[PDB]
Design a protein around this ligand. Structure first.
Ligand SMILES: *[C@@H]1O[C@H](CO[C@@H]2O[C@@H](C)[C@@H](O)[C@@H](O)[C@@H]2O)[C@@H](O[C@@H]2O[C@H](CO)[C@@H](O[C@@H]3O[C@H](CO)[C@@H](O)[C@H](O)[C@@H]3O)[C@H](O)[C@H]2NC(C)=O)[C@H](O)[C@H]1NC(C)=O
Ligand code: NAG
Ligand code: CL
Ligand code: CL
Ligand code: ZN
Length: 586
């Protein structure tokens, strides 16, 4: 009865802390030191954690959950009934675990080489080419080269990955892996909700897209941009065209109001990765939120090692499930983009610290998007010309309506452009998992969706054997993407709420929440819930209402919408890409 179920949950929490902590240390050791030995130890620890998951999952499934009264225990038990990959028979489990490691390793160590020349890694070398080169053919070399080396090499693994991850899902009572993932949101309306939200951002995105396309035409030439077609995917300042702010220089609304070069300013002033994380730590504590522990500074990997070594560079935050040991692993570069990423990662660390006294089963965000949003919310304030001037990374840009529209454009290039991208990635993998896209059409459907949602085209026709989704980290790493779409919507809701909590008046985009304890309190109360309640409860605690809504994001960018509509109107832009079949001729 109730006593047996309460006891079970207590034993699960005790044992899980121990085994999860062991697994986390082995996983960290491989991620920060990719070798045969650390791979071997990780794959061994995979079997140890599966043994535990199987043991407790099997006992959990013997409880009739709806006979149980207490709702917190009902909830933990239902969750422990999901064995995830541990539902697989032993041979398939070992195969699956090896496939995942091989995909991660392949992505993380791929390089692109000039013939008889230097070989470039994604971080920082190719990322730097995409962000700074203004030459069509140099950008193409990097963009195609990365797909040829990373994308194509992932293809041999992906169909077996999909088979095994779906098999695990069905064994746990889902129809496929995507169903399994989406279930974390506990929102039956989720599909419709995401479509509605995507549609509300259309006026802003289509106008931003049309304006950017016009500027690219100006720079790259009339023979290379079709003003009524999709934009070549290598021209947007980012390897995946997911965020476009690195081409700010090409699209400045008011060039008479130029901004300080922020990378130059950071470097000349001796900014370092540690300083970047220290500044993030300060922002959190200014809100009354928790500082990271001394152990964090000892054990974190805040830059790429120099001791001849392979690591997974992609930025991540790590909970070691003992309530003390939290770490970030990031190949940090000294620039503004990575300052924002550092805040994002520190938001994950904050969430870990806030829910650390919950049972480990409930040590997650209210939904995964909440976990992604916390750091980004603070980074919105960090990004204001006010805050950046106070860091001496910008001159005084206060006052002018020119600098103001410029600032909004700079933010839009990341925040608005990302909405269709995150939607695309979500939809593609959804349809791979549900079987609507097979290995016969992985790449063709990727590009159909790239066109349909983002209005982008590949600069070079794709060929058989290309697997461009493989060249995006989250695909081989099997990290869900819907979280980021959700994050980008809700972070503006949170910003709007925290700003009114802090007593900001005037346009939302001028808000800076630095030092607001009232704002800190809203966040903390929500984060302390972890995964203990339906996510609308945490949304309510932060915002005073329970829905996901694009209205805050639209309010923030309202003055840019007006400016873009006027600008595009006078140039006669035809929004969208009615000439959707257009691709580059040369
Ligand atoms: C349903 O059950 C939950 C969970 O209860 C806890 O875990 C069980 C498996 C058993 O081990 C229980 O002995 C244990 O209480 C109940 O939620 C818990 O309620 C208590 C009492 O309100 C909360 O106590 C707080 O604890 C913090 C310190 O951690 C103090 O600072 C607070 O002042 C306060 O005393 C406890 O946090 C809470 N735990 C969780 C995980 O939610 C719940 O009350 C119960 N429902 C009903 C209707 O009885
Ligand atoms: C890297 O890996 C090996 C185990 O393969 C280990 O002996 C060594 O201590 C590790 N090096 C670092 C810098 O962690
Ligand atoms: Cl691509
Ligand atoms: Cl997700
Ligand atoms: Zn994140």
């Amino acid at each position: 009865d109730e006593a047996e179920a309460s006891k079970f949950v207590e034993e699960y929490d005790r044992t899980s802390q121990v085994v999860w902590n062991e697994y986390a240390e082995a996983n960290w050791n491989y991620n920060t030191n990719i070798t045969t030995e650390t791979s071997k130890i990780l794959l061994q620890k995979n079997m140890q954690i599966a043994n535990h998951t199987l043991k407790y999952g099997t006992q959990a499934r013997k409880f009739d959950v709806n006979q149980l009264q207490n709702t917190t225990i009902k909830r933990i038990i239902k969750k422990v009934q999901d064995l995830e990959r541990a539902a697989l028979p032993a041979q398939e489990l070992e195969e699956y675990n090896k496939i995942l490691l091989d995909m991660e390793t392949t992505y993380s160590v791929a390089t692109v080489c000039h013939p008889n020349g230097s070989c470039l890694q994604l971080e920082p070398d190719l990322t730097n080419v995409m962000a700074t080169s203004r030459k069509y053919e140099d950008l193409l070399w990097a963009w195609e080269g990365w797909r040829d080396k990373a994308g194509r090499a992932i293809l041999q693994f992906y169909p077996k990955y999909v088979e095994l991850i779906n098999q695990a899902a069905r064994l746990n009572g889902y129809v496929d892996a995507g169903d399994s993932w989406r279930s974390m949101y506990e929102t039956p309306s989720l599909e419709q909700d995401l479509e509605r939200l995507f549609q509300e951002l259309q006026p802003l995105y289509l106008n931003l897209h049309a304006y950017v396309r016009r500027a690219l035409h100006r720079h790259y030439g009339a023979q290379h941009i079709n003003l009524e077609g999709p934009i070549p995917a290598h021209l947007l300042g980012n390897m995946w065209a997911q965020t476009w702010s690195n081409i700010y220089d090409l699209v400045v609304p008011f060039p008479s109001a130029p901004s300080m070069d922020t990378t130059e300013a950071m470097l000349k002033q001796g900014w370092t990765p540690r300083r970047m994380f220290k500044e993030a730590d300060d922002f959190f504590t200014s809100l009354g939120l928790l500082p990271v522990p001394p152990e964090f500074w000892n054990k974190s990997m805040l830059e790429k090692p120099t001791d001849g070594r392979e690591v997974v560079c992609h930025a991540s935050a790590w909970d070691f499930y003992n309530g003390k040991d939290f770490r970030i692993k990031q190949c940090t570069t000294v620039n503004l983009e990575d300052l924002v990423v550092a805040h994002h990662e520190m938001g994950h660390i904050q969430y870990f610290m806030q829910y650390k006294d919950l049972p480990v089963a409930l040590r997650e965000g209210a939904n995964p998007g909440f976990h992604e949003a916390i750091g980004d919310v603070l980074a919105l304030s960090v990004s204001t010309p006010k805050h950046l001037h106070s860091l001496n990374l910008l001159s005084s840009e206060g006052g002018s309506d020119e600098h103001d529209i410029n600032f909004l454009m700079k933010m839009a290039l990341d925040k608005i452009a990302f909405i269709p991208f995150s939607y695309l990635v979500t939809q593609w993998r959804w349809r791979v998992f549900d079987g609507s896209i097979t290995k016969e059409n992985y790449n063709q459907e990727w590009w159909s969706l790239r066109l349909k949602y983002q209005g982008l085209c590949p600069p070079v026709p794709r060929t058989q054997g290309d697997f461009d989704p493989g060249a995006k980290f989250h695909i081989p790493s099997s990290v869900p993407y819907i979280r980021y779409f959700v994050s980008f919507i809700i972070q503006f809701q949170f910003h709007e709420a925290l700003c009114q909590a802090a007593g900001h008046t005037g346009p939302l985009h001028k808000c800076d929440i630095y030092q607001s304890k009232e704002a800190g309190q809203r966040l903390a109360t929500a984060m302390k819930l972890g995964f203990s309640r339906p996510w609308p409860e945490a949304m309510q605690l932060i915002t005073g209402q329970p829905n996901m809504s694009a209205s805050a994001m639209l309010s923030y960018f309202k003055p840019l919408l007006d400016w873009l509509r006027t600008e595009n109107e006078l140039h006669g832009e035809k929004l969208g890409w009615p000439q959707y079949n257009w691709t580059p001729n040369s």
